[PDB]
Design a protein around this ligand. Structure first.
Ligand SMILES: Nc1nc2c(ncn2[C@@H]2O[C@H](COP(=O)(O)OP(O)(O)=S)[C@@H](O)[C@H]2O)c(=O)[nH]1
Ligand SMILES: C=CCN1CC[C@]23c4c5ccc(O)c4O[C@H]2C(=O)CC[C@@]3(O)[C@H]1C5
Lengths: 287, 54, 337, 350
């Protein structure tokens, strides 16, 4: 009995996440402030999070019922949007890392790429790359009305042993091996640049905000890594070691799925926890 | 000293002797100038995109 | 000896009841029938970026396309606001500059500040780069404002409570305007270029004749230092902005204040004032990161120009009146339509 | 989009490249703002930083100060003579009245100090008079130049026809300026720009926000002003005026993150003045002894108590004698080391 008393928490978390993401999208549009490249990157991350959390009730219907009456195209877009928010969140955080690298470590030439046109181009082409790598799961999504249960998991053409694990390996090596390594080496370069020598006696007022932004980006990256590592290592050890099934293994899997999904709701309260740009708007509207 | 104390008295002497028109007439003249040149003020009548160089 | 004040005060009373004698109406009472301007919003069409310190003063041009802006970083940038370019970047001998000016011919740029020297830089060298041509000296205080009259005469104001009219070629003070008991902070030139007003920290604005050289009228009413002044476009009124968070529209013919522009929950001083082409809209730069857009006849807030991180410090409306340029301490100029 | 105005864009790019280089250079320097009341030694500190961190003074720069030195000596001796009228002091000799009249006769010119043989003789004769020395010894009852004794004591070598000012002669020159005086030097691989607004006869409020963001404020307070008086109301002291000026500057909203370095200047006069004039003239509530160490510590304590942000910002106090190159050098080394370690404290990770 783990399905009747568990849907309320999922529904509350998903509605709080979508409300926070909607409030984030609301406070960047047609405002004189909220224009810089990092903030529109946070906009892109928030819309990806909103797209992730909008499909939480539609996924939870099959758990709270055991039947999938939604439709063929309906599961064609929920498994495709799941590879969306996994791939483009670590690539948005990857472009945040190279944005901070070209700002602090790099010289004043940072005022040659900070223009929002290049940031929008980077965001659009990043989504293009994510959709180009995610079109196979649009192509190969269907629902099978099996006698044991109903399922619409991803299938493969000519499986042998060349298409059932190469996808898992390629996803794992292009979600944590590729971008987290460059993120970690970029923060290493950032810390050595910032703490090998002293700092110039410049505009502290316009530098404390930059330091706070870098701190918030580092906190976002750290919470994303700690909330997305266990599910990926569980996937790898499931697909390679293939341990025999157990009750506590299933409990661990169902816990780590929610731990992976909770990033979409943790982020809007995270970057608004300590930041003066959103706090006065929140205080004005909360009255 | 005495020269400074006499300078502002001389200035107030030459300042109170001017002719003052009524507030109503001057304000009406300001109003009439406001309507007379209102059609050539792009801030009052903002064209969206046609003749604005910006 | 001590009986000069007891008749200076009766001269003041004569002035005040002569003003009250001809005050049978007011501007707000007769403009109850003119239609309101509604809400006048303006979008930032251009964002002139490239300064690295607090911009302190800017001035437009007669061609209404180029402009000059002076910043704390010792830079006079002569821009090209159509394409957002940087035509010139003049380095200053002293980075302490509080005012800048573009000549109406467009061939000269004045700057000045805490160095107490008004530097006239020639833009049409006919040989090479922009270099200094005149260094007008003689002030004993910070240069607060300077407007060109033509290529050979300039009017400046200083913190030694005097204004001056300089001949550039001889380099001397042709005329000196005294009478202020506080530091002059801003002067505005009349459109007919024969009179000019100047507001000082003694909470008063004085009207001066350039050709003769004496004060004619002294307008009071403000409760703090006047930081800004601007003639109404017909040359027969002028608005003043002060540190007591009010603007005032004084009239040279009625010799008194007609209108006050103020609102509750506004406590910051006014740094700049300017008028539109027709003078219907009065633009006032504030210290609360906003540039209010008042109606000069209804005394109500038509619009607001937000978008500056730091204090708005200088305003400018073009000769053809299309755009408003707003400088600020966050090193950004903004163009509005 | 394939236009002819590519030249304007390239010129703008060259402009912003040069401007970015200049901004990088300007962000990598230490800005010191010298503040304080009048006759507190700010310009002498400027000249000392010129001496230490540059070539000093050349033959032309020394020879251009000779007329100003002569004018300062003439002004100090005229002030000393004219103080006899307001102090009612009899001359030691009857010929000193004729000497004073002759001094007024030869000081008719108001362009520059001449200091001919006759002027040298008359000032030397007036300098040995007991009444003149007595009037100089009661200088606290009126206004006198602080370098009067130094200039008039070596009057024999000053008044030579081929006299060239030395480092101390240029250094102890009381000269009036109008604009802001800023000097450039380099020290400990750091460029220093120093500013002074002492000659700025204006309102301090209207430009004190122009120095927001400076690295340090060196507030020069002369210790020898405790026994002096102000000749405007006969109820205000120069030390109290300097104290309230420091209270304004230190607790100003523009200097929240500025290092305040107090320079308690003219301690060498304070040592020779504390033995005779008590500190109770300035502070009526003083209960300590009339010794130099306790009095200097008390003035430092009062100036530190003028602060209202002791738990956030620390005032770095140093005693200086601004005409001593070695003491100024040592105090400036301490100041630069404090600035450098506070800049390392500004370096952090987040
Ligand atoms: N005996 C003695 N005299 C000193 C010392 N330091 C400075 N002075 C003198 O004090 C006067 C005002 O100086 P200054 O011009 O800088 O004023 P200011 O710019 O602050 S308004 C100058 O004539 C200096 O010789 C010192 O240690 N000992
Ligand atoms: C934390 C939830 C994100 N999920 C996305 C889809 C999937 C998944 C993840 C990682 C890599 C995959 O290839 C992959 O496909 C799926 C799978 O095989 C089971 C685990 C997941 O539901 C999970 C994380």
């Amino acid at each position: 009995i783990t399905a009747i008393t568990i849907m309320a928490l999922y529904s509350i978390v998903c509605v709080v996440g979508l409300f926070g993401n909607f409030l984030v999208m609301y406070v960047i549009v047609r405002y004189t402030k909220m224009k810089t490249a990092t903030n529109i990157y946070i906009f892109n991350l928030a819309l990806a999070d909103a797209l992730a959390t909008s499909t939480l009730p539609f996924q939870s219907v099959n758990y709270l019922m055991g039947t999938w009456p939604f439709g063929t195209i309906l599961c064609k877009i929920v498994i495709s949007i799941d590879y969306y928010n996994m791939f483009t969140s670590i690539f948005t955080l990857c472009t945040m890392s190279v944005d901070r690298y070209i700002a602090v470590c790099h010289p004043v030439k940072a005022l040659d790429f900070r223009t929002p046109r290049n940031a929008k181009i980077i965001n659009v082409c990043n989504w293009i790359l994510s959709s180009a790598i995610g079109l196979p799961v649009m192509f190969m999504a269907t629902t099978k009305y099996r006698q044991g249960s109903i399922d619409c998991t991803l299938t493969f053409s000519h499986p042998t042993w060349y298409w059932e694990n190469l996808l898992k390996i390629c996803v794992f090596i292009f979600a944590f091996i590729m971008p987290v390594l460059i993120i970690t080496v970029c923060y290493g370069l950032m810390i050595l640049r910032l703490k090998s020598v002293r700092m110039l006696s410049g505009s502290k007022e316009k530098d404390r905000n930059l330091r706070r932004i870098t701190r918030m980006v580092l906190v976002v990256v750290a919470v994303f890594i700690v909330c997305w590592t266990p599910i990926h290592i569980y996937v790898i050890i499931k697909a390679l070691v293939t341990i025999p099934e157990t009750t506590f293994q299933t409990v661990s899997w169902h816990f780590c799925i929610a731990l992976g999904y909770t990033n979409s709701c943790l982020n809007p309260v995270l970057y608004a926890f300590l930041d003066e740009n959103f706090k006065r708007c929140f205080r004005e509207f909360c009255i | 000293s005495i020269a400074q104390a006499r300078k502002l008295v001389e200035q107030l002497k030459m300042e109170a002797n001017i002719d003052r028109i009524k507030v109503s007439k001057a304000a009406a003249d300001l109003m009439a100038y406001c309507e007379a040149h209102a059609k050539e003020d792009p801030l009052l009548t903002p064209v969206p995109a046609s003749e604005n160089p910006f | 000896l001590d009986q000069l004040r007891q008749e200076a005060e009766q001269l003041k009373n004569q002035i005040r009841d002569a003003r009250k004698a001809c005050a049978d109406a007011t501007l707000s009472q007769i403009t109850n029938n003119i239609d309101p301007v509604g809400r006048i919003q303006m979008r930032t069409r251009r964002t002139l970026r490239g300064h690295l310190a607090k911009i302190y003063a800017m001035h437009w041009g007669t061609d209404s396309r180029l402009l000059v802006s002076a910043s704390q970083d010792g830079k006079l940038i002569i821009w090209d606001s159509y394409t957002t370019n940087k035509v010139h970047a003049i380095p200053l001998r002293s980075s302490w500059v509080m005012t800048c000016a573009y000549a109406p011919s467009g061939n000269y740029v004045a700057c000045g500040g805490l160095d107490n020297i008004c530097s006239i830089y020639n833009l049409k060298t006919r040989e090479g780069n922009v270099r200094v041509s005149r260094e007008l000296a003689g002030h004993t205080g910070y240069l607060s404002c300077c407007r060109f009259l033509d290529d050979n005469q300039i009017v400046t104001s200083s913190g030694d409570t005097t204004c001056a009219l300089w001949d550039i070629e001889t380099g001397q003070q042709t005329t000196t305007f005294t009478g202020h008991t506080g530091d002059v902070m801003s002067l505005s030139l009349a459109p007919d270029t024969r009179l000019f007003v100047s507001g000082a920290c003694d909470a008063s604005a004085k009207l001066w004749d350039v050709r003769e050289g004496m004060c004619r009228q002294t307008f009071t009413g403000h409760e703090s230092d006047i930081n800004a002044i601007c003639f109404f476009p017909n040359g027969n009124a002028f608005a003043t902005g002060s540190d007591d968070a009010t603007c005032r529209l004084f009239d040279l013919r009625a010799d008194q204040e007609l209108m006050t522009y103020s609102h509750d929950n506004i406590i910051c001083g006014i740094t700049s004032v300017s008028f539109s082409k027709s003078g219907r809209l009065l633009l006032a730069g504030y210290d609360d990161f906003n540039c209010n857009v008042w109606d000069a006849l209804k005394a109500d807030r038509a619009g607001v120009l937000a978008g500056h991180d730091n204090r708005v410090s200088c305003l400018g409306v073009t000769d053809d009146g299309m755009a408003v340029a707003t400088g600020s301490w966050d090193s950004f100029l903004k163009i509005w339509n | 989009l394939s236009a002819e105005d590519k030249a304007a864009v390239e010129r703008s790019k060259m402009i912003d490249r040069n401007l970015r280089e200049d901004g990088e250079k300007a962000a990598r320097e230490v800005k010191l703002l010298l503040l304080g009341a009048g006759e507190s030694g700010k310009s002498t500190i400027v000249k000392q930083m010129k001496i230490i961190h540059e070539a000093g003074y050349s033959e032309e720069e020394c020879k251009q100060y000779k007329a100003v030195v002569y004018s300062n000596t003439i002004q100090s001796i005229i002030a000393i003579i004219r103080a006899m009228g307001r102090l009612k002091i009899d001359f030691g000799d009857s010929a000193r009245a004729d000497d004073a009249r002759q001094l007024f006769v030869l000081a008719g010119a108001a362009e520059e100090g001449f200091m001919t043989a006759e002027l040298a003789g008359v000032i030397k004769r007036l300098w040995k008079d007991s009444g003149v020395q007595a009037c100089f010894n009661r200088s606290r009852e009126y206004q006198l130049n602080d370098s009067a004794a130094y200039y008039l004591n070596d009057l024999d070598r000053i008044a030579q026809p081929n006299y060239i000012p030395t480092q101390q002669d240029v250094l102890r020159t009381r000269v009036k300026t109008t604009g802001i005086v800023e000097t450039h030097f380099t020290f400990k691989d750091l460029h220093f720009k120093m500013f002074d607004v002492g000659g700025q006869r204006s309102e301090r409020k209207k430009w004190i926000h122009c120095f927001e963001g400076v690295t340090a404020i060196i507030f020069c307070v002369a210790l020898s002003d405790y026994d002096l008086v102000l000749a405007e109301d006969e109820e205000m002291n120069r030390m109290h005026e300097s104290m309230k000026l420091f209270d304004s500057i230190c607790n100003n909203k523009w200097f929240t993150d500025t290092s305040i370095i107090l320079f308690l200047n003219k301690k060498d006069l304070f040592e020779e003045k504390i033995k005779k004039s008590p500190l109770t003239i300035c502070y009526p509530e003083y209960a300590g002894s009339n010794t130099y160490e306790e009095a200097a510590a008390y003035i430092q304590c009062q100036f530190e108590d003028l602060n209202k942000r002791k738990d956030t910002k620390e005032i770095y106090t140093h005693f200086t004698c601004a005409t001593d190159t070695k003491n100024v050098q040592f105090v400036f080394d301490a100041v630069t080391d404090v600035i450098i370690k506070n800049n390392l404290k500004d370096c952090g990770l987040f």
